[PDB]
Design a protein around this ligand. Structure first.
Ligand SMILES: O=P(O)(O)OC[C@H]1O[C@H](O)[C@H](O)[C@@H]1O
Ligand SMILES: O=P(O)(O)OC[C@H]1O[C@H](O)[C@H](O)[C@@H]1O
Ligand SMILES: [Mg+2]
Ligand SMILES: [Mg+2]
Lengths: 204, 204
């Protein structure tokens, strides 16, 4: 069971930069094995390269509360009622950094939060038909009573508002489409599947 | 409660397409309201633009099985053990098409599956800090005993293998990281939260 082929079955011949900016768009040229037994010809695909991210679900297990951060995401504009989204704390992982380093730095910069214990949730590919981006989600223990106000680095043109909701209310917002970005959906569905054991572990 | 600002609170000054090929790399220039009052200066953001997608989770409620499709996604290569991924059926929504029409068409083209009833799951933004892409997921009733074979438009360099597994195995693969693309994680977490009611609904 499971997948059929490995890295032994594909050769990346070359990569070419198509667009070089803050982010990049690359052309990968490659050949690969086929399910019918043969080899493909040389194929090309465009791939959006923007690095990889750490995501933190800030969960208060005592109060059963979740911290959300609100900020504009202009890319949401064309398909959303508003480009301001309710999200998990998140940021890019720089060379040599750990997921936890980033999650803790972003929790402070974006939400004013200290973080206690942490556990992995999931690491996922955002949209692997067109981008390499991987996001690694942690749940972090927080005191939601300390989560409030406006944060973000104005030097980065980052303007962020903290919201505190109950876990049930956050999940209701997913169901209703009020929270509709992948990282937050994945994190909050995970929390609905795991909260009983997580709260027991963190309130012993 | 919820979000603070609407489309009246942002002015998109300019959009430019800096790269156009299979996909597009756009630049948005805009100003927006700030939480503490007033307006930002002009902000520029690069946005990966690839249109929007329909996704179908093929679920057999009699058998408690899901149908997965396997194909190479070279963008996964740098952060994954193999670039062949296990995924939901999916494809682009063209002008004036509905999510449901596309989902039903792709289930036949990618997996050879006829679909019975459908229900919405969720519609999400894949990674809204850098891409506009929205994906809308349905669950689709299938007879998984009919799911077999190799599919794809070879003229479009598309090579796809169909797998049938129990829902429980598919979900355990999410937990283990063997299924780790956003659309499949979201769909299978949703299924884990909803399958009991869905099976009752679809096996009357
Ligand atoms: O199956 P394709 O038509 O290549 O692409 C459909 C979607 O599934 C893949 O993850 C892509 O990134 C898209 O979001
Ligand atoms: O908060 P940022 O540093 O802008 O970006 C972190 C992640 O959250 C946003 O959806 C982006 O697309 C990334 O995937
Ligand atoms: Mg951030
Ligand atoms: Mg497809």
């Amino acid at each position: 069971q499971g997948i059929t082929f490995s890295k032994n079955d594909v050769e990346i011949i070359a990569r070419e930069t198509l667009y070089r900016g803050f982010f990049s768009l690359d052309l990968y040229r490659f050949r690969h094995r086929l399910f019918n037994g043969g080899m493909s010809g040389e194929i090309t695909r465009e791939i959006f390269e923007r690095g990889h991210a750490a995501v933190l679900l800030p969960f208060d297990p005592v109060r059963d509360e979740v911290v959300l951060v609100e900020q504009i995401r202009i890319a949401a504009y064309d398909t959303s009622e508003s480009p301001w989204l309710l999200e998990m704390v998140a940021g890019m992982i720089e060379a040599g950094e750990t997921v936890e380093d980033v999650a803790r730095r972003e929790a402070l910069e974006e939400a004013g939060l200290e973080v206690g214990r942490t556990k992995p949730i999931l690491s996922y590919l955002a949209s692997p038909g067109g981008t390499s981006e991987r996001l690694s989600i942690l749940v972090g223990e927080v005191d939601a009573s300390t989560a409030k106000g406006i944060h973000g680095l104005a030097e980065e043109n980052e303007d962020i508002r903290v919201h505190v909701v109950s876990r049930e209310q956050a999940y209701q917002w997913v169901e209703e489409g009020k929270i509709d970005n992948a990282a937050s959906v994945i994190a909050l569905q995970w929390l609905q599947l795991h909260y009983h054991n997580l709260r027991n572990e963190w309130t012993k």
